[PDB]
Amino acid sequence: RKLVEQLKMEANIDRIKVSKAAADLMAYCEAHAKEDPLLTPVPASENPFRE
Amino acid sequence: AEDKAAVERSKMIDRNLREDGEKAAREVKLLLLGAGESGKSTIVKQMKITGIVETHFTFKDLHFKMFDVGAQRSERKKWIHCFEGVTAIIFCVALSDYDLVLAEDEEMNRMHESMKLFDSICNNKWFTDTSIILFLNKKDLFEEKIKKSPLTICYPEYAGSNTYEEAAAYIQCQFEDLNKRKDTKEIYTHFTCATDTKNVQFVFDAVTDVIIKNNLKDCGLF
Amino acid sequence: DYVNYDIIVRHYNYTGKLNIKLTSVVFILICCFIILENIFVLLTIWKTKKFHRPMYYFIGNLALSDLLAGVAYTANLLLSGATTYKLTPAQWFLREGSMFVALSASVFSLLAIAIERYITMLKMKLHNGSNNFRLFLLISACWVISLILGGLPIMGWNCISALSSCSTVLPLYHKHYILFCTTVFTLLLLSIVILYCRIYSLVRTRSRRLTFRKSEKSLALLKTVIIVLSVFIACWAPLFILLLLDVGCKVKTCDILFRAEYFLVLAVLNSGTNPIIYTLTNKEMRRAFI
Amino acid sequence: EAEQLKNQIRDARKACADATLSQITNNIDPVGRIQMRTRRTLRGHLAKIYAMHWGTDSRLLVSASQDGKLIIWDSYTTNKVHAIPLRSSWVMTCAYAPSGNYVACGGLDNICSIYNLKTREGNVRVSRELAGHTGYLSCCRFLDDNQIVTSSGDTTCALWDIETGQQTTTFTGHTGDVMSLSLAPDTRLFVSGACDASAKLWDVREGMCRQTFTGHESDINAICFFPNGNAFATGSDDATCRLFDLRADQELMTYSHDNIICGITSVSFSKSGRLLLAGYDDFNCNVWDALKADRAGVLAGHDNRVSCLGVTDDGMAVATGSWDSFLKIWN
Numbered sequence: 066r067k068l069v070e071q072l073k074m075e076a077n078i079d080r081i082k083v084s085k086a087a088a089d090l091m092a093y094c095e096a097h098a099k100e101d102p103l104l105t106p107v108p109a110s111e112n113p114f115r116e
Numbered sequence: 117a118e119d120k121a122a123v124e125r126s127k128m129i130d131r132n133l134r135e136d137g138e139k140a141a142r143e144v145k146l147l148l149l150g151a152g153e154s155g156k157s158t159i160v161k162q163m164k165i166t167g168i169v170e171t172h173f174t175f176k177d178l179h180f181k182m183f184d185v186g187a188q189r190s191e192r193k194k195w196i197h198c199f200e201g202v203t204a205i206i207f208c209v210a211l212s213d214y215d216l217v218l219a220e221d222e223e224m225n226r227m228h229e230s231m232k233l234f235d236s237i238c239n240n241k242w243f244t245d246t247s248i249i250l251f252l253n254k255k256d257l258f259e260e261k262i263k264k265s266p267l268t269i270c271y272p273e274y275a276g277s278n279t280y281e282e283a284a285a286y287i288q289c290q291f292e293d294l295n296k297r298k299d300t301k302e303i304y305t306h307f308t309c310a311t312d313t314k315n316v317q318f319v320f321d322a323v324t325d326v327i328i329k330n331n332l333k334d335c336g337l338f
Numbered sequence: 339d340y341v342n343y344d345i346i347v348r349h350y351n352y353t354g355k356l357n358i359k360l361t362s363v364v365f366i367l368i369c370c371f372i373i374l375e376n377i378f379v380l381l382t383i384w385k386t387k388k389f390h391r392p393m394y395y396f397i398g399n400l401a402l403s404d405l406l407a408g409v410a411y412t413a414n415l416l417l418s419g420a421t422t423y424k425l426t427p428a429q430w431f432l433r434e435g436s437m438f439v440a441l442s443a444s445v446f447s448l449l450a451i452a453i454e455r456y457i458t459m460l461k462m463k464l465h466n467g468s469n470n471f472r473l474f475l476l477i478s479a480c481w482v483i484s485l486i487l488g489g490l491p492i493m494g495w496n497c498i499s500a501l502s503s504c505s506t507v508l509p510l511y512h513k514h515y516i517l518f519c520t521t522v523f524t525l526l527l528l529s530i531v532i533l534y535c536r537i538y539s540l541v542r543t544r545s546r547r548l549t550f551r552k553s554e555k556s557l558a559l560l561k562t563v564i565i566v567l568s569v570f571i572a573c574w575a576p577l578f579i580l581l582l583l584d585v586g587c588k589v590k591t592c593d594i595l596f597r598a599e600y601f602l603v604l605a606v607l608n609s610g611t612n613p614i615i616y617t618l619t620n621k622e623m624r625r626a627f628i
Numbered sequence: 629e630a631e632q633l634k635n636q637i638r639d640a641r642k643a644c645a646d647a648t649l650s651q652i653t654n655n656i657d658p659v660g661r662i663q664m665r666t667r668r669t670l671r672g673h674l675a676k677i678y679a680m681h682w683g684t685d686s687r688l689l690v691s692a693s694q695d696g697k698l699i700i701w702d703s704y705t706t707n708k709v710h711a712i713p714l715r716s717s718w719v720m721t722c723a724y725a726p727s728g729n730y731v732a733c734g735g736l737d738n739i740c741s742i743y744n745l746k747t748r749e750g751n752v753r754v755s756r757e758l759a760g761h762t763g764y765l766s767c768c769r770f771l772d773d774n775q776i777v778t779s780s781g782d783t784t785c786a787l788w789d790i791e792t793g794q795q796t797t798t799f800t801g802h803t804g805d806v807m808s809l810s811l812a813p814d815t816r817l818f819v820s821g822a823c824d825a826s827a828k829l830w831d832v833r834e835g836m837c838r839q840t841f842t843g844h845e846s847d848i849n850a851i852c853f854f855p856n857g858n859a860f861a862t863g864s865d866d867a868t869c870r871l872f873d874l875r876a877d878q879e880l881m882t883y884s885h886d887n888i889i890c891g892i893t894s895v896s897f898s899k900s901g902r903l904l905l906a907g908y909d910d911f912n913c914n915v916w917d918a919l920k921a922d923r924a925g926v927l928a929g930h931d932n933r934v935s936c937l938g939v940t941d942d943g944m945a946v947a948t949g950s951w952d953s954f955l956k957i958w959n
């Protein structure tokens with residue numbers, strides 16, 4: 066009874082088409098692309114592990 | 117103003133780390149394993165004279181740490197590799213478990229379960245060059261039992277007579293055949309009882325033999 | 339002097355040696371074989387990350403010594419014969435001292451390996467430390483003593499001042515120098531033999547005290563020690579005896595002293611035997627090779 | 629009934645995949661080759677390294693080794709700020725409190741030890757020991773200076789109250805060993821991956837499993853939250869990584885390659901979530917492009933398997949810890 070009870074509570078859940086989730090992930094990654102040092106090599110002067 | 121102090125403190129910490137590592141490198145590491153109703157507790161009790169239990173004992177100018185992990189009901193393949201690098205593995209079997217069934221109580225012979233465990237451990241990829249000290253426990257109880265119930269109840273293919281020496285050697289051989297890495301590691305065997313007084317000596321000699329073999333392998337002489 | 343082409347003629351004439359060969363071809367082939375073997379050994383100790391422990395540096399040191407000995411023997415074969423008389427005494431001393439330095443280096447590398455092994459089996463320590471102080475001390479003493487011992491004749495101590503004291507084998511060497519070199523070889527041979535005997539004795543005595551139920555490592559060890567010592571002595575005994583006889587026999591008395599190339603090729607052969615002996619018995623090098 | 633419930637879940641999921649992630653992300657420019665170099669090398673551990681965790685200041689980090697040491701490093705200067713002698717050397721995880729005051733660790737002792745760093749004497753004392761788990765400790769993460777979440781081999785997770793030392797909440801429902809966990813940025817949810825080859829999303833306030841995610845064919849060894857808290861990534865023993873979205877309740881992307889056949893030990897994201905760094909058993913760390921299923925870099929500097937992996941909160945550096953006993957800061 067415990068197993069069916071958990072699954073039944075996992076069925077009545079507000080899902081969305083995967084396209085919307087893909088769009089959200091893509092948008093979020095684009096929005097913070099100008100602040101990711103490992104993605105955009107920062108100038109050596111502002112990098113604490115070079116000088 | 118503070119970087120000098122920082123570097124000094126780091127150098128002191130390095131000093132202590134080096135000294136602790138040097139001290140820890142002079143200790144033998146033993147991993148203790150066995151089935152439930154084996155005589156593992158007896159081995160630990162006579163060798164001392166919620167998680168993982170460590171027992172430290174010093175014998176003949178040699179310090180040993182023995183780690184017992186019997187209280188891990190979790191899956192073994194997630195943490196067995198943590199013991200890669202121990203000097204040796206002590207494995208305990210109970211000779212009296214040959215006529216005994218498991219908690220299933222339908223066909224799961226206890227001795228077969230112990231054999232399966234020994235086979236899994238001996239041929240495990242993480243323990244290829246690591247030796248196994250085998251302790252066959254309960255030898256007095258076994259001796260008494262085999263006067264009544266023939267060994268055939270375990271190992272149906274066994275024509276040998278029902279006497280202690282013959283069947284005991286038979287089971288020793290059955291366990292030593294399961295070894296597939298028959299070239300890289302040894303399997304030292306010793307028939308324990310309730311009271312022997314010489315099991316620490318046997319473990320000491322086994323570890324000394326392993327040490328000599330490893331030294332010869334550090335040279336090119338092995 | 340050191341720039342007079344008449345000195346070599348004068349000494350070879352005194353020792354009775356005043357004169358391409360076929361045997362040179364086979365000897366050069368043997369030298370190429372030795373060079374190839376030692377290059378393989380050196381390449382194996384480098385490619386495998388596991389082989390970075392002190393004991394492996396000693397093996398590679400021996401490999402380098404044997405490679406150098408092969409190269410020196412090749413050069414000495416190329417520049418010998420009729421190229422001797424077209425040679426300045428300085429060039430002559432260089433040609434001979436190259437061989438002396440190389441073979442001495444190989445023997446000292448064998449001693450170095452023996453010393454490391456005897457230190458390791460005396461400690462009996464659970465992990466063997468990658469100590470570098472002795473690894474530098476021993477691998478440097480080898481080459482330094484080799485260069486000093488093999489450089490003495492050119493920096494004086496030769497037969498040029500007085501022709502009476504000339505070995506028949508190297509007519510521009512002083513027999514006392516050859517006696518010194520043979521004594522040094524004797525000390526090195528005794529050291530290596532005693533070291534390996536003590537290693538075997540340690541292993542056997544320690545294994546005797548252990549009580550198992552009804553040797554295996556104390557017999558294969560004896561076989562390995564026998565192989566090592568026997569091969570070494572068999573390869574180096576003919577030339578050592580030859581040079582003792584040379585220090586003894588007077589000029590123009592012993593004909594054997596003229597066909598000394600066979601003894602030299604056997605002693606250089608030991609350099610080819612070394613990689614086989616110190617790689618096949620490891621039983622870990624073999625896997626790393628492939 | 630259970631079979632029909634699973635069928636309904638499957639159908640309601642397959643009715644959401646109108647188009648695969650690769651399609652919508654198809655045209656965005658590829659990241660190109662990513663090249664990072666070892667700007668530091670931390671030395672001092674004398675055994676395997678099993679876990680590391682960056683401090684929130686992005687300068688100090690803690691590493692746990694089977695040599696029985698918890699070492700707190702300054703990654704700028706490489707100075708060892710602290711060295712803590714753990715009572716049990718069989719550590720598997722370690723955490724750094726967001727405030728920089730405490731560290732945690734644990735392992736085969738089944739205990740979560742909590743150590744106080746800022747003390748009047750100036751030495752590191754053991755502050756608390758959390759003892760209610762029945763299997764080993766796989767992972768631990770503070771929520772603040774007084775709450776910590778732990779995952780265990782006993783197939784359970786726990787939320788603790790450090791002051792009183794009592795399990796405040798228990799999360800049951802996994803069927804295998806729980807191997808890793810990752811707190812959501814908001815600190816209200818957390819995901820756990822287990823040896824039953826499934827991940828679960830847990831509500832910390834309530835204590836119930838909200839969603840289960842499947843697809844992996846073996847143990848999930850690592851799990852990391854995506855920066856915006858609406859997705860996570862799991863690395864498995866089937867030599868694969870996968871990306872799941874909570875609102876879709878479905879698998880989006882799968883990062884794998886034929887040349888890759890070993891297991892995954894750790895996963896992390898870059899500060900923007902565009903790069904997915906995964907450590908592997910074959911001694912390397914691959915830099916996947918999260919949006920586009922394409923490898924874009926390799927961090928190859930270790931001789932044994934890359935056991936742990938981390939990214940700073942500022943996103944400036946990566947940390948790799950390996951069984952070869954060395955940590956490397958990559959930039």
Ligand SMILES: CCc1cc(/C(C)=N/OCc2ccc(C3CCCCC3)c(C(F)(F)F)c2)ccc1CN1CC(C(=O)O)C1
Nearest residue numbers: 418419422437438441442445519520522523581598599602
């Ligand atoms: C005629 C044959 C010949 C012989 C030689 C000799 C005798 N090399 O001896 C090497 C040596 C090296 C090292 C040692 C040891 C010293 C102590 C430490 C361990 C090594 C010894 C030693 F003696 F000590 F054992 C000997 C050299 C060149 C030629 C060929 N030349 C071209 C030919 C010609 O032109 O006729 C002359």
Ligand SMILES: *[C@@H]1O[C@H](CO)[C@@H](O)[C@H](O)[C@H]1NC(C)=O
Nearest residue numbers: 347348350351352354356357
């Ligand atoms: C060899 O030596 C003898 C006596 O010393 C001398 O008469 C003879 O001319 C020498 N031969 C040559 C070719 O110089």
